[PDB]
Amino acid sequence: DLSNPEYLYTEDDINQLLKHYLGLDDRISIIQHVALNESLLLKQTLHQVLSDIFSGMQEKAVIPLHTGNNHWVAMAIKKGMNDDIVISYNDPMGVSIDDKVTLINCIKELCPGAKINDLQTVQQTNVYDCGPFVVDNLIKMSQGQPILSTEEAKQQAQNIRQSQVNFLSENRMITSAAAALADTLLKNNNRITEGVLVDRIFDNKILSVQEKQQLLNNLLSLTKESLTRMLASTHFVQQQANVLL
Protein backbone atom coordinates (compact mmCIF):
# COMPACT_ATOMS: atom_id res chain seq x y z
CA ASP A 1 0.00 0.00 0.00
CA LEU A 2 1.61 3.27 -1.24
CA SER A 3 -0.06 5.38 1.52
CA ASN A 4 1.82 3.29 4.14
CA PRO A 5 4.91 5.45 5.32
CA GLU A 6 6.83 2.11 5.47
CA TYR A 7 6.00 0.92 1.91
CA LEU A 8 9.07 -0.75 0.31
CA TYR A 9 9.69 0.52 -3.26
CA THR A 10 9.68 -2.28 -5.86
CA GLU A 11 11.79 -2.44 -9.05
CA ASP A 12 8.82 -1.13 -11.09
CA ASP A 13 8.31 1.78 -8.65
CA ILE A 14 11.94 2.96 -9.06
CA ASN A 15 11.81 2.46 -12.87
CA GLN A 16 8.58 4.55 -13.10
CA LEU A 17 10.13 7.33 -10.98
CA LEU A 18 13.44 7.43 -12.88
CA LYS A 19 11.61 7.46 -16.31
CA HIS A 20 9.34 10.25 -14.98
CA TYR A 21 12.23 12.44 -13.73
CA LEU A 22 14.98 11.77 -16.37
CA GLY A 23 13.13 10.25 -19.37
CA LEU A 24 12.99 13.42 -21.56
CA ASP A 25 16.74 12.93 -22.27
CA ASP A 26 16.96 9.79 -24.50
CA ARG A 27 20.79 9.84 -23.91
CA ILE A 28 20.22 8.57 -20.30
CA SER A 29 19.99 4.76 -19.96
CA ILE A 30 17.57 3.76 -17.14
CA ILE A 31 18.55 0.21 -16.05
CA GLN A 32 15.68 -1.78 -14.46
CA HIS A 33 16.92 -5.17 -13.14
CA VAL A 34 20.44 -5.64 -11.68
CA ALA A 35 21.35 -7.55 -8.48
CA LEU A 36 24.74 -8.32 -6.89
CA ASN A 37 23.66 -11.98 -6.37
CA GLU A 38 23.43 -12.32 -10.21
CA SER A 39 27.11 -11.64 -11.14
CA LEU A 40 26.83 -12.75 -14.80
CA LEU A 41 23.80 -10.52 -15.53
CA LEU A 42 25.47 -7.61 -13.65
CA LYS A 43 28.64 -7.81 -15.79
CA GLN A 44 26.54 -8.10 -18.97
CA THR A 45 24.54 -5.06 -17.83
CA LEU A 46 27.57 -2.88 -16.93
CA HIS A 47 29.34 -3.92 -20.17
CA GLN A 48 26.31 -2.92 -22.33
CA VAL A 49 26.20 0.46 -20.52
CA LEU A 50 29.97 1.00 -21.00
CA SER A 51 29.71 0.02 -24.72
CA ASP A 52 26.83 2.54 -25.22
CA ILE A 53 28.99 5.29 -23.61
CA PHE A 54 32.07 4.29 -25.69
CA SER A 55 30.04 4.58 -28.95
CA GLY A 56 28.36 7.89 -27.92
CA MET A 57 24.83 6.50 -28.35
CA GLN A 58 24.28 7.09 -24.56
CA GLU A 59 25.92 9.71 -22.24
CA LYS A 60 24.96 8.32 -18.83
CA ALA A 61 23.24 5.47 -17.02
CA VAL A 62 21.28 5.38 -13.76
CA ILE A 63 21.36 1.97 -12.05
CA PRO A 64 19.21 1.02 -8.90
CA LEU A 65 21.41 -1.88 -7.64
CA HIS A 66 19.70 -4.66 -5.61
CA THR A 67 21.97 -5.94 -2.79
CA GLY A 68 21.54 -8.38 0.12
CA ASN A 69 18.33 -8.19 2.24
CA ASN A 70 16.21 -6.36 -0.39
CA HIS A 71 18.57 -3.36 0.04
CA TRP A 72 18.87 -0.80 -2.80
CA VAL A 73 21.99 1.30 -3.60
CA ALA A 74 22.55 4.06 -6.19
CA MET A 75 25.08 3.78 -9.00
CA ALA A 76 25.45 6.32 -11.82
CA ILE A 77 27.88 5.92 -14.76
CA LYS A 78 28.66 8.91 -17.01
CA LYS A 79 31.17 10.22 -19.51
CA GLY A 80 33.34 12.59 -17.49
CA MET A 81 35.61 15.37 -18.66
CA ASN A 82 38.28 14.57 -21.21
CA ASP A 83 38.04 10.79 -21.86
CA ASP A 84 37.01 9.72 -18.36
CA ILE A 85 34.32 7.22 -17.32
CA VAL A 86 32.96 8.37 -13.93
CA ILE A 87 31.22 5.87 -11.62
CA SER A 88 29.30 7.68 -8.84
CA TYR A 89 27.91 5.55 -5.97
CA ASN A 90 25.94 5.96 -2.72
CA ASP A 91 24.55 3.30 -0.39
CA PRO A 92 21.70 5.02 1.71
CA MET A 93 22.98 3.07 4.77
CA GLY A 94 26.39 4.77 4.32
CA VAL A 95 28.22 1.45 3.57
CA SER A 96 31.37 1.69 1.37
CA ILE A 97 31.30 0.52 -2.26
CA ASP A 98 34.39 -1.50 -1.18
CA ASP A 99 32.05 -3.73 0.94
CA LYS A 100 30.42 -4.81 -2.36
CA VAL A 101 33.23 -7.16 -3.47
CA THR A 102 31.29 -8.60 -6.45
CA LEU A 103 30.60 -5.08 -7.83
CA ILE A 104 34.24 -3.93 -7.36
CA ASN A 105 35.54 -7.09 -9.15
CA CYS A 106 33.04 -6.50 -12.02
CA ILE A 107 34.15 -2.84 -12.41
CA LYS A 108 37.92 -3.66 -12.25
CA GLU A 109 37.35 -6.26 -15.04
CA LEU A 110 35.28 -4.03 -17.41
CA CYS A 111 36.74 -0.54 -16.89
CA PRO A 112 39.84 -0.51 -14.54
CA GLY A 113 40.51 3.15 -15.59
CA ALA A 114 37.05 4.27 -14.28
CA LYS A 115 37.03 7.13 -11.72
CA ILE A 116 35.18 5.72 -8.67
CA ASN A 117 33.27 8.36 -6.68
CA ASP A 118 31.88 6.71 -3.52
CA LEU A 119 29.95 9.48 -1.72
CA GLN A 120 29.55 7.12 1.31
CA THR A 121 26.77 9.12 2.95
CA VAL A 122 24.39 7.70 5.60
CA GLN A 123 20.92 8.96 4.59
CA GLN A 124 18.19 6.49 5.65
CA THR A 125 17.05 6.58 9.33
CA ASN A 126 14.90 3.40 9.11
CA VAL A 127 14.77 0.01 7.30
CA TYR A 128 12.29 1.33 4.64
CA ASP A 129 13.77 4.48 3.02
CA CYS A 130 16.43 2.93 0.66
CA GLY A 131 13.97 3.27 -2.27
CA PRO A 132 13.30 7.08 -1.84
CA PHE A 133 17.04 7.86 -1.32
CA VAL A 134 18.22 5.73 -4.29
CA VAL A 135 15.78 7.68 -6.51
CA ASP A 136 16.86 11.10 -5.16
CA ASN A 137 20.56 10.06 -5.37
CA LEU A 138 20.31 8.74 -8.97
CA ILE A 139 18.62 11.98 -10.15
CA LYS A 140 21.26 14.22 -8.53
CA MET A 141 24.37 12.11 -9.24
CA SER A 142 23.38 11.87 -12.96
CA GLN A 143 23.75 15.72 -13.26
CA GLY A 144 26.83 16.12 -10.95
CA GLN A 145 24.63 17.83 -8.30
CA PRO A 146 25.42 17.21 -4.57
CA ILE A 147 23.25 14.43 -2.94
CA LEU A 148 21.48 15.05 0.40
CA SER A 149 23.93 15.08 3.36
CA THR A 150 23.23 12.95 6.46
CA GLU A 151 21.64 16.06 8.10
CA GLU A 152 19.51 17.16 5.09
CA ALA A 153 18.54 13.46 4.62
CA LYS A 154 17.30 13.29 8.22
CA GLN A 155 15.35 16.53 7.65
CA GLN A 156 13.91 15.66 4.16
CA ALA A 157 13.27 11.84 4.31
CA GLN A 158 9.46 12.05 4.62
CA ASN A 159 9.19 14.99 2.14
CA ILE A 160 11.14 13.26 -0.68
CA ARG A 161 9.11 10.05 -0.05
CA GLN A 162 5.81 11.95 -0.14
CA SER A 163 6.72 13.77 -3.40
CA GLN A 164 7.75 10.46 -5.07
CA VAL A 165 4.74 8.48 -3.76
CA ASN A 166 2.34 11.25 -4.97
CA PHE A 167 3.61 10.53 -8.53
CA LEU A 168 3.42 6.72 -8.04
CA SER A 169 -0.25 6.99 -6.88
CA GLU A 170 -1.26 9.33 -9.74
CA ASN A 171 0.69 7.13 -12.24
CA ARG A 172 -1.06 3.93 -11.07
CA MET A 173 -4.54 5.48 -11.06
CA ILE A 174 -4.19 7.21 -14.46
CA THR A 175 -2.72 4.01 -15.96
CA SER A 176 -5.58 1.87 -14.52
CA ALA A 177 -8.19 4.34 -15.85
CA ALA A 178 -6.40 4.44 -19.26
CA ALA A 179 -6.13 0.61 -19.46
CA ALA A 180 -9.83 0.13 -18.60
CA LEU A 181 -10.89 2.66 -21.30
CA ALA A 182 -8.42 0.95 -23.70
CA ASP A 183 -10.10 -2.43 -22.97
CA THR A 184 -13.60 -1.04 -23.76
CA LEU A 185 -12.32 0.52 -27.03
CA LEU A 186 -10.34 -2.59 -28.17
CA LYS A 187 -13.15 -5.11 -27.41
CA ASN A 188 -12.04 -8.49 -28.96
CA ASN A 189 -9.03 -6.91 -30.74
CA ASN A 190 -5.34 -7.01 -29.67
CA ARG A 191 -4.64 -4.30 -32.30
CA ILE A 192 -6.82 -1.69 -34.07
CA THR A 193 -6.56 0.84 -36.92
CA GLU A 194 -6.93 4.62 -36.43
CA GLY A 195 -10.22 4.30 -38.35
CA VAL A 196 -11.53 1.52 -36.11
CA LEU A 197 -10.46 3.45 -32.96
CA VAL A 198 -12.39 6.52 -34.18
CA ASP A 199 -15.42 4.36 -35.12
CA ARG A 200 -15.31 2.87 -31.60
CA ILE A 201 -15.10 6.38 -30.03
CA PHE A 202 -18.11 7.67 -32.08
CA ASP A 203 -20.17 4.52 -31.26
CA ASN A 204 -19.29 4.41 -27.52
CA LYS A 205 -22.55 4.66 -25.48
CA ILE A 206 -21.03 5.89 -22.14
CA LEU A 207 -18.75 8.87 -23.07
CA SER A 208 -20.41 12.26 -23.71
CA VAL A 209 -19.90 14.56 -26.74
CA GLN A 210 -17.39 16.79 -24.85
CA GLU A 211 -15.34 13.75 -23.69
CA LYS A 212 -15.44 12.15 -27.20
CA GLN A 213 -14.47 15.47 -28.90
CA GLN A 214 -11.84 16.25 -26.21
CA LEU A 215 -10.56 12.68 -26.85
CA LEU A 216 -10.12 12.93 -30.67
CA ASN A 217 -8.72 16.46 -30.05
CA ASN A 218 -6.37 15.28 -27.25
CA LEU A 219 -5.26 12.55 -29.74
CA LEU A 220 -4.69 15.26 -32.40
CA SER A 221 -1.07 -0.06 -35.45
CA LEU A 222 -2.45 0.58 -31.93
CA THR A 223 -2.12 -2.02 -29.15
CA LYS A 224 -3.39 -2.31 -25.58
CA GLU A 225 0.01 -0.85 -24.50
CA SER A 226 0.20 2.06 -27.02
CA LEU A 227 -3.50 2.96 -26.62
CA THR A 228 -3.18 2.87 -22.79
CA ARG A 229 -0.18 5.22 -23.08
CA MET A 230 -2.20 7.52 -25.40
CA LEU A 231 -5.28 7.60 -23.16
CA ALA A 232 -3.06 8.27 -20.09
CA SER A 233 -1.91 11.56 -21.71
CA THR A 234 -5.56 12.72 -22.18
CA HIS A 235 -6.95 15.45 -19.84
CA PHE A 236 -10.35 13.78 -19.22
CA VAL A 237 -8.77 10.39 -18.25
CA GLN A 238 -6.57 12.30 -15.76
CA GLN A 239 -9.83 13.89 -14.46
CA GLN A 240 -11.46 10.45 -13.82
CA ALA A 241 -8.35 9.15 -11.97
CA ASN A 242 -8.26 12.41 -9.89
CA VAL A 243 -11.88 11.76 -8.74
CA LEU A 244 -10.72 8.24 -7.73
CA LEU A 245 -9.27 9.75 -4.47
Numbering used by the authors: 6 to 225, 234 to 258
Sentences from the paper on this structure:
Here we report biochemical and structural data on the DUB domain of O. tsutsugamushi OTT_1962, hereafter called OtDUB. Primary sequence analysis revealed conservation of a DUB-like catalytic triad (His76, Asp96, Cys135) and Trp77, suggesting that the Ulp1-like domain is catalytically active and not an acetyltransferase, respectively. OtDUB preferentially cleaves ubiquitin chains having at least three ubiquitins and efficiently cleaves both K48- and K63-linked chains, unlike other members of this clan that prefer K63 chains. In summary, we have uncovered a unique DUB from the obligate intracellular pathogen O. tsutsugamushi that is capable of efficiently cleaving long ubiquitin chains of different linkages and binding ubiquitin with extraordinary affinity.
We cloned the N-terminal domain of OtDUB from genomic DNA of the O. tsutsugamushi Ikeda isolate and included residues past the putative DUB domain (1–311) to examine a potential accessory domain that could modulate DUB activity. We determined the crystal structure of the apo-enzyme at 2.0 Å resolution, which revealed that the Ulp1-like domain of OtDUB has the predicted core fold of cysteine endopeptidase (CE)-clan proteases. OtDUB lacks an N-terminal VR-1; instead, the C-terminal accessory domain (residues 170–259) protrudes into the VR-1 position via an extended α-helical arm positioned close to the catalytic site, suggesting that it assists in substrate binding. The C-terminal region of the protein fragment, residues 260–311, was apparently disordered and not observed in the structure. When compared to the phylogenetically closest structure, RickCE from Rickettsia bellii, we observed structural conservation of only one VR: the small loop in VR-3. Besides lacking the N-terminal VR-1 present in RickCE, VR-2 of OtDUB comprises a loop and two short α-helices, while RickCE VR-2 is a large helical arm largely absent in OtDUB. These large structural differences between the two DUBs, and other prokaryotic CE-clan structures, are obvious when aligned, yet the core protease fold is conserved (Cα root-mean-square deviation (RMSD) 1.2–3.9 Å). A substantial structural transition of the UBD was supported by the apo-DUB-UBD1–311 crystal structure, which lacked density for residues 224–235 at the beginning of the UBD, a region that includes the ubiquitin-interacting residues D226 and K230.
